[PDB]
Structure formats: C-alpha cells, structure tokens
Design a binder for these strands. Sequence first.
RNA 1: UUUU
Length: 637
Amino acid sequence: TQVDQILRDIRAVVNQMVPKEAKITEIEFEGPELVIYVKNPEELIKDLAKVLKKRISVRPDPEVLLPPEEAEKLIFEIVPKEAEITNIAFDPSVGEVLIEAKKPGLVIGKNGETLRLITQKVKWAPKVVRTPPLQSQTIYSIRQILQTESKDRRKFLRQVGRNIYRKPEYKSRWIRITGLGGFREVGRSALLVQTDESFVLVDFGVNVAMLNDPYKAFPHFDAPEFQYVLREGLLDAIIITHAHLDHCGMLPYLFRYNLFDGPIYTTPPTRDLMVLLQKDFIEIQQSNGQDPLYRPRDIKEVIKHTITLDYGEVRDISPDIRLTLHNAGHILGSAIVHLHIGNGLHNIAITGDFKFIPTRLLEPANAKFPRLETLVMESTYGGANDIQMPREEAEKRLIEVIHNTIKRGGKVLIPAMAVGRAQEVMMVLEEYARIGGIEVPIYLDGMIWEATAIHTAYPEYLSRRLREQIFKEGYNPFLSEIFHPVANSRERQDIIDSNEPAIIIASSGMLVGGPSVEYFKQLAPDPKNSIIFVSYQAEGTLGRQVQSGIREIPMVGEEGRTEVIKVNMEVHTIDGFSGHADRRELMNYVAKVRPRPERIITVHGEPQKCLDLATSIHRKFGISTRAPNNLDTIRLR
RNA sequence: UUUU
Ligand SMILES: [Zn+2]
Ligand SMILES: [Zn+2]
C-alpha cells in the first residue's frame, strides 16, 4: 500500500484550502469517504471535494464528544418537547446522534437554527427522522449492533480505506467477468469482475430450490480464479443488487469460514432486508430439523462489514473501480450496479433483477448512465412468448378468484417471499379495500409484516406517489387495519381449522419452506380452497410442481417417512404482479437504455431464455450479445 | 459535497 503516502498529498492540499483555526486534528480514510476531523464548528466542502475527486465528511474531533448516557438527557432538554421524540440513538463511530422525532419540522429548527444550536451542547451530528408507522426488530437490531461495536467498525473502515487507496487512480491493463453462478440459470447469482489490479464480487446467492445438492446450490467455489482471490485475500469488495436469497443468500457463509472480511456495498434497504431474509432462512431450516448453512453471528458479521450507499452516489471502491447504484424497480432497495473501471476505460452495468414499467411500490429501472459499454442483464422472462399478463387484467383476475372462492366457503393461499410480491399484492388489495371489496380478513404470515415495517422506514426508496402518501400525510396503506399479522404457531393452526374464509399470504413464495408450506399441505385436499402463484416458480421447487398440475405430491417428513399430499384445491397462476420485466419489457429496456452498449450479456434465466433473449436482441438491434455459461470468462478489454 |  501507499495510502498514507497519498494522504500526505491530500493533507497538503486540504490544510491549504481551510483556515488553520479549524485546528485540523486528523484526516483519515473511512471506507470510500475521506474524514477530516476538526476542533471547531463551521460551500467550501463542495469545492474541496470537486478537486480531490472524493467524498469528504468533516466532523468535530471525537474528543469534544459527550457519552450517550450524559448527552441524552442533555439534548432531550434543548428541544421543543412537543415533537414526540420516540427514540434517540447514538453513533460515536461517526459522531452523529439520531433524533427519531414524530415531528421533524419542530426539532430541526423552525428556521434552520435549532440545527446548530442543539449540536453544540454535545457536539454530535444532529440528524432528524420521522418516527416510522411501523417498528422493526431488524432495524433496531442493526442499530444495536452498530453502536455496541463502534470499536471494530472504526477499525474495519480505516482498513477498507487504506485498501481502496493502496494507490492512485489506475488505468487497468485488462478487465474480465466470470460467472460463478446465475449464468444460463436462475439462482445463486454470482459474478466476479477482474482487472490486473482488483476483484469485486457482484452478488453471491444460493439456490434454496436445491440445497439438497450443494454443487447445484452454491456459486462455484471450485473456480481456480475465485479460490485464488479468496485464499490470497484479494477480494476488494462484494456488491448486492437486492435482498433476495438468490443474490445475497450465501454472503454470510463467507464469514462462517473466514473466507473474507472486506466491504459489502448495498442500498440501506437491501442491507436491512437481506439481514431479515437470512435470519428467516436459517430459522426455517432449523424448524425443519436441518443443520443451518450459517448462524446469527455470521449474519452479525455481514452487518458489521456492510457499507451502505444510496442511489446515484458515486464512490471509489478500489484503485481502478468506481461504483454507483441505480434503481432497478424490482423490490425496495433493488439496484442496478454500475462499474466505472479505469478512468474512462470501460463501463459495466449489471442489472440484477429489474422491472421496466411502474408498479404500486416502485418506478421503472434507471435506463440512463453517464457511460455504458457493457450491459449484463437478467432473462427470467427472456423467452419470445414470455409476455406477462397486463397488471390490470391480473388485478381483476385476483379479485375474481377470491370471490369465487370465498363464495364457495373457502380460503385463498397466496405464497410470496416476505419481500417483493407480498407488499405489491398487499397494495392491490388495500386500494381495493378502500372501495368496499375486502370482506374476509387477510393474514400475513412469515416475516411479511416485519418486512413491511422496513418498507415504511424507507419512503425515499418507494415511488414518489407512495412516498409522499407516507410521511407527508398521517396516512399509510401498510397500516391498514385490514391486515392481520399471524402472531404465532397456534394462531396459524386456528386459522387453518377455522371455517371463516380468509386470504392467507405467506412465505416462502415458492412453497420452498416456511409458513406457506403448512397451509399448502393442509389446504390441498379441500377443493373449496384456492392457491394463487404470483411469482416465478423455479425448477426444483414444490411450487412449480404444484403449479404444473401434479395432483399427488410425495413429501418426505420426519423419521424419514414420506407423505403424499393430495392436491385438490384450485391452482391459479397470476403473473401480472411480477417484479420481473417480461419479454417485451426486456427488449424495450435495450431499445431505451442509454448510452447504447457495445455488448450485452444475458444471464439469470433458464438456458433457452438467455439464449433466446441474446439472439433476439442481436437480430433486432444488431448489438453484440452473448449468453455465457457459469465458469465462462469474458475478457471485456 | 469525485469521475469517463
Ligand atoms: Zn429478486
Ligand atoms: Zn433473482
């Protein structure tokens, strides 16, 4: 490394554009950003940063700070006690106190004055928030881990920084991308980006549809290049497109075996959401009497290593790679990953899963980038006939099936992952509720409610409409008194036994595990009940099996004896709520993406589909395309 | 409050 050698030049230009009265105590690197500590308060920053080509954060010296047990009631006083301040956390690792007030306007300073007045008394960065409608165990837990681990996090960030700046901006000699999983297949997405100077992992999923076979369930750990990057400790960073297990599922496995301790970049909502899905994942395994892939301490490590980034925020993550995340419109926090390699040498955009039309919760994926030579895109519906049903026709079909089900005295089972389709279908029923249509109750089972809480904590990540409809008003469609969160194992049993028709939405989305499987098993026989698939059912899942028509499904239970569930209930498939761009959308994304890429690489789709989309794009746009296999490596330059 |  030669970082402090570089800081020696940074410090020579910083202490050259700011009054010595600022008594600059220290200037170090914290993750991507540069930290300039000073022992005194107070347009300059904007200039300092535009010159240094970095993200600078200037805070008071960590010495002029007050303990969280003394600076708590010291602030609670210097604030108009009207704005109900539900909570008030502490972040000493970055000097910044969080004021989770119910009324932010009366706590920040009616005239932007109670902003600096308050900070003084304790010398902590005053940041106001609006007590979200729902409380999240997950968010609270993360906050707990971050504040009670300030020591490590500080150590970790300083290291990452010395790493990211082990040398000045570099122009790479070559660039290659290798598929470790998720190429010509759905699941276990994992793409390794290489240059002669760096290595970054884009996603690292698992395929729950096949944990039975680790060679089909995990990314290729058996790739020479990947083993070489892990063992030598050369992985600069891991980036996650979105929270689903098939993109971040194996991430904690990495810590369980001490294979990595570098930074993980992702949007805040994805950090919170993935942590949720991971705990949910190991617990479902255990409830099944199976040894879990990892444990809470491992997930605790993920948290401790994650460096969040909001959309549009450009950050240097290595000497020759610059990251920027953009909206993918797939699920809360979903991002298209953009890599600016070299200083104008080459640019890659990895799509992850994306939707290119509006939905209740999100806006179509970003299709504009400053530069874009190579585009890696998903192909879940890459087939030529993979046109999803129009959103409104689906919506109407969903209400239809429910009526023809409630009428004949039955229940409607809607399997869906805690994150994604669940909230989308919720909205559909919630708007339909406000106009008199939701008679029977709607039960949410499987951490779907916990996930819904996280949504309400991130209004800025939802569509502008749903966003304003959140904080600006005292309204919230998620709070709707029409959803009844299934509290425990018992309540679940009651619901099943009861005779009151009802709508049941529960994870997992593919009947691969969790609350959804119990309902399935118990409702299958009765033809009064109905099951509606509103998500892609992957090959190898009990879901696709049921969705395919199989009427007698063998299932292995305890003490090794198999069970044969008799499927009589009605089987319906409504794909119009999909979080995936359909065939038309994918093609249309290519047409609109700008700048037009030199080459497109189709991935994340059944083999035929990746092939089909790739062949189709080339034929219609004349763009160089390819549908690589895992372990294929494409030299981009 | 960095860039091609
Ligand atoms: Zn997904
Ligand atoms: Zn996926």
